Amino acid sequence: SGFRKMAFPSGKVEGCMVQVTCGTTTLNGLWLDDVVYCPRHVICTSEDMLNPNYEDLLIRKSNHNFLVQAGNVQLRVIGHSMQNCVLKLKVDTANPKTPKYKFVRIQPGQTFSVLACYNGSPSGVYQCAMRPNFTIKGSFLNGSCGSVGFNIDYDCVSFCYMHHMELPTGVHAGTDLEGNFYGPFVDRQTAQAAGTDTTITVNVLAWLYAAVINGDRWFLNRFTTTLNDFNLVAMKYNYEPLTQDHVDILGPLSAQTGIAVLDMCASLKELLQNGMNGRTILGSALLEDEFTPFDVVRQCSGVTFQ
Amino acid sequence: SGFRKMAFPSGKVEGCMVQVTCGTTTLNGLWLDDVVYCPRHVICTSEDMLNPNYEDLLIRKSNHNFLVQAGNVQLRVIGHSMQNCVLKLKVDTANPKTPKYKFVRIQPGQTFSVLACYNGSPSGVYQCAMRPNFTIKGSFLNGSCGSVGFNIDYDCVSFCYMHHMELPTGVHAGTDLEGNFYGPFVDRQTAQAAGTDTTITVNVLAWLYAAVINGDRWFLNRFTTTLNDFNLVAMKYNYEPLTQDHVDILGPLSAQTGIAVLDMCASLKELLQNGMNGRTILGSALLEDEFTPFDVVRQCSGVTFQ
Ligand SMILES: *C(=N)[C@@H](NC(=O)[C@@H]1[C@@H]2[C@H](CN1C(=O)[C@@H](NC(=O)C(F)(F)F)C(C)(C)C)C2(C)C)c1cncc(F)c1
Ligand SMILES: *C(=N)[C@@H](NC(=O)[C@@H]1[C@@H]2[C@H](CN1C(=O)[C@@H](NC(=O)C(F)(F)F)C(C)(C)C)C2(C)C)c1cncc(F)c1
């Protein structure tokens, strides 16, 4: 038992982290086979970042302008190209630690592990959700750009996120590994801002089920509600709509606990309207929305990776 | 910026996790050099666990009674011995992935990363604190025994915890890697229970400093307090005493924020007496005590590992 904001074991990703230097800018790259992926803004000077023409900026670069450090071993860059907002640095060595991997783009509301990295050196790992507004509430300091987010299914690393920037509210924006930003963010120095977020309702419900599985039951009730009536409450508390597909996805957790999804919705409704009256759920005094139903099943049933 | 309950990158530990089977019991072992460490209760049957004489139980075992699975490669056990509550299985192969490591015993209030494991396969990683009552609020399912807790300093893994059991409140008890339990727990089936816990005051203060560093300032005030007057409040809210050494340890965070430690204590005092009035700190509506000052400095300054 117990419930922790659990990340995937990071080893498979640690073996792909490299340091990419261009000019005075050092950031992280992801070394898979003979390509190193990194944020294209690595090529930018401070003033470049004001209004960069990346095609212009990149045509003025050479392979030798990119230093790739894989631990204490330099990789020779033999090609460079831009794919959307990522750079692809072709190197003369295939990473012998390349895991089986996929480049997947995730949905807001889904979770992933982040291996926060500095100078190509992994610093820590933690679990994030993609917010409905396509930001992530990460933990990133200067030099963290190019750190990647990922999930692991058995032995395959699904890379879904690479860090590009911190928005003014302290939240983070980045791309998938094809270089396409999550959300309406750009890798230049605009006044861009996160914009309004919502709470991930299906995840809160999942987490309430995790709570029940772990013996927190005080928020349960005999009440039930209809999906429409719940969604009327969800909307008022800035929760996103619950769909029938969310209900279906919660089926296994509902079956395991014997609490009908709509009964849990009634509990959530009460929690939203009454708050928690000084009590806690799974050690939180807030409704937690960064665990998916999958995360709950994984942690309250016990799947591993290899 | 941002603040996440961050674990160390787990790769170095992942390479040490093996599966140990004895009889029908399968659990995790830690494979370092040519020794596999695992909970000694691996040798126990269900009825053995009632009142086990481990010396008797172990003398009746042979090397061939221990199957060690390192991934999909079996390790040949060539020796076994008991060290307190851990078994040391000597195997004929030194783990080629053995990191530089130490066996350290931590203090209540200190934190570590847990690589939760099943059948020798790492499942997830998360950050724990050793509670004042020597339990940890982990996330462990059946088969997690032998999963280890650790910290990483540059390239050296300091193993500090190996999981042995879940107590009735859903918290977890285990040993250091010399096999000595943390706290007054035993690897047998008694009615043992966690016993009373306290909140780790210096950690809460550290986390308040992390909050300030991250722009949460609403809980600040011009007030100050004396250490004795703060500790009078701490005691009443079941917080553990703040020592001058804690104050000293908070020095760097105090210098970085310009908030005197005793001023932060005054803020904590107000938070304890008034609660938080619907506001949050670093995304929590509770005072968080599982970040040490070190964890805060590490995450709000940016140290890596290699
Ligand atoms: C990564 N090493 C670092 N981030 C950057 O260098 C990004 C890159 C350049 C500037 N930048 C920012 O994150 C900035 N944000 C913005 O300009 C924004 F508000 F998002 F529009 C700063 C650092 C000024 C907040 C790009 C926008 C392409 C970095 C990443 N994460 C956290 C950090 F503290 C630093
Ligand atoms: C690990 N694979 C599993 N834990 C055990 O097998 C421990 C070992 C045997 C029984 N045990 C327990 O954790 C039990 N606890 C107690 O007897 C206690 F309350 F602590 F006294 C059970 C599982 C009945 C709660 C030892 C006590 C030596 C395990 C570990 N962590 C979580 C799990 F769900 C299971």
Side-chain angles (χ1 to χ4, degrees), chain A residues 1-2 4-5 7 9-11 14 121 123-125 137-141 166 172 283 286 290 299 301 303-306, chain B residues 1-2 4-5 7 9-11 14 121 123-125 137-141 166 172 283 286 290 299 301 303-306:
Chain A
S1 82
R4 280 283 187 185
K5 188 178 289 294
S10 57
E14 294 168 48
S121 283
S123 167
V125 59
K137 299 167 171 296
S139 172
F140 290 121
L141 306 175
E166 176 169 304
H172 301 108
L286 290 186
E290 287 200 9
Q299 195 168 160
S301 162
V303 178
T304 47
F305 309 97
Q306 209 189 36
Chain B
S1 82
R4 280 283 187 185
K5 188 178 289 294
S10 57
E14 294 168 48
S121 283
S123 167
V125 59
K137 299 167 171 296
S139 172
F140 290 121
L141 306 175
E166 176 169 304
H172 301 108
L286 290 186
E290 287 200 9
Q299 195 168 160
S301 162
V303 178
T304 47
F305 309 97
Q306 209 189 36

Side-chain angles (χ1 to χ4, degrees), chain B residues 79-92:
Chain B
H80 56 288
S81 64
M82 182 176 71
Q83 175 162 326
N84 305 306
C85 296
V86 296
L87 265 184
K88 299 172 65 169
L89 297 178
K90 182 64 70 177
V91 300
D92 63 6

Side-chain angles (χ1 to χ4, degrees), chain A residues 174-232:
Chain A
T175 65
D176 63 29
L177 272 295
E178 321 279 12
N180 304 299
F181 278 86
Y182 287 103
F185 307 112
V186 294
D187 49 351
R188 50 177 155 110
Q189 189 74 40
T190 73
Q192 53 194 330
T196 66
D197 210 18
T198 47
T199 293
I200 308 156
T201 309
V202 59
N203 286 4
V204 176
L205 294 171
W207 170 79
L208 288 177
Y209 279 110
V212 171
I213 293 172
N214 277 274
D216 283 340
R217 309 181 58 89
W218 62 262
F219 51 84
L220 296 179
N221 56 61
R222 81 194 280 180
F223 308 155
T224 189
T225 191
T226 67
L227 180 47
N228 305 328
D229 293 349
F230 172 78
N231 274 322
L232 284 186

Side-chain angles (χ1 to χ4, degrees), chain B residues 41 49 140 142-145 163-166 168 189-190 192:
Chain B
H41 70 238
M49 283 312 277
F140 290 121
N142 304 348
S144 62
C145 296
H163 186 49
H164 286 246
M165 66 183 180
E166 176 169 304
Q189 189 74 40
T190 73
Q192 53 194 330

Side-chain angles (χ1 to χ4, degrees), chain A residues 234-252:
Chain A
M235 185 179 288
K236 288 183 127 163
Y237 288 90
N238 191 208
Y239 271 52
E240 52 182 356
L242 199 71
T243 67
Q244 185 58 38
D245 189 53
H246 292 149
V247 173
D248 296 336
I249 281 168
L250 290 167

